[PDB]
Write an enzyme that holds these catalytic residues in place. Structure first.
Site, short mmCIF file in Angstrom:
data_model
loop_
_atom_site.label_atom_id
_atom_site.label_comp_id
_atom_site.label_asym_id
_atom_site.label_seq_id
_atom_site.Cartn_x
_atom_site.Cartn_y
_atom_site.Cartn_z
N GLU A 6 -6.61 -5.21 1.63
CA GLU A 6 -7.59 -6.23 1.25
C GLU A 6 -8.84 -6.16 2.12
O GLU A 6 -9.95 -6.40 1.64
CB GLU A 6 -6.99 -7.64 1.33
CG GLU A 6 -7.93 -8.69 0.74
CD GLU A 6 -7.22 -9.95 0.27
OE1 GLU A 6 -6.02 -9.87 -0.08
OE2 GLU A 6 -7.86 -11.02 0.24
N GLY A 62 -11.92 -12.48 -2.32
CA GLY A 62 -10.68 -11.97 -2.88
C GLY A 62 -10.09 -12.94 -3.88
O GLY A 62 -9.99 -14.14 -3.61
N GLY A 102 -18.19 -4.97 -11.89
CA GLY A 102 -18.87 -5.80 -12.87
C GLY A 102 -19.81 -6.82 -12.27
O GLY A 102 -19.92 -6.95 -11.04
N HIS A 107 4.95 -0.42 -2.09
CA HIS A 107 5.26 0.26 -0.83
C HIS A 107 6.07 1.49 -1.21
O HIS A 107 7.17 1.38 -1.75
CB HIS A 107 6.04 -0.68 0.06
CG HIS A 107 5.29 -1.92 0.40
ND1 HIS A 107 5.75 -3.19 0.10
CD2 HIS A 107 4.06 -2.09 0.93
CE1 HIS A 107 4.84 -4.08 0.44
NE2 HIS A 107 3.80 -3.44 0.94
#
Length: 137
Positions: A62, A81, A107, A88
């Site tokens: 992230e 976010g 976008g 994993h």
């Protein structure tokens, strides 16, 4: 492609004294359409039994993905976010992992990024997709 000029020194300075710095994450390199960050696999990032914590791998994904997104916007623009997912693939016991972010779709209101994390032996240990909202700050 990047809409803002930047330097690895300044990006790391921007991420200083935060969860990023706390996890030993370092923005390490970038190309024309990608950017990477490394993170060590030690007691700060491992599960109690000696392997990289998958949750922490997502934190790395992230981080690099959100940073990348913010560098693809003009002035008065930033990302937040919205959601993220990851698989994993294999346990990591030592060295540092490298997470590379590449755009999937940029976008006007939503950005979607791909993050591939590899071991020091260049093997994929985690793959993730991040969805970001674009908003006027």
């Amino acid at each position: 492609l990047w809409k803002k000029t930047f330097t690895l020194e300044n990006l790391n300075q921007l991420c200083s004294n935060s969860a990023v710095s706390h996890l030993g994450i370092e923005i390490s390199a970038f190309g024309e359409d990608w950017i990477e960050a490394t993170m060590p696999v030690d007691h700060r990032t491992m599960q109690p039994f000696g392997v990289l914590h998958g949750g922490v791998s997502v934190a790395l994904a992230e981080t690099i993905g959100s940073l990348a997104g913010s560098l693809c916007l003009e002035e008065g623009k930033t990302v937040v976010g919205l959601d993220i997912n990851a698989n994993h693939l294999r346990p990591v016991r030592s060295g540092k992992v490298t997470a590379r972010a590449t755009p999937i779709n940029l976008g006007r209101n939503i950005q979607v990024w791909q993050i591939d994390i590899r071991t020091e032996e260049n093997k994929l240990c985690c793959v993730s997709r991040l969805t970001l909202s674009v908003i006027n700050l």
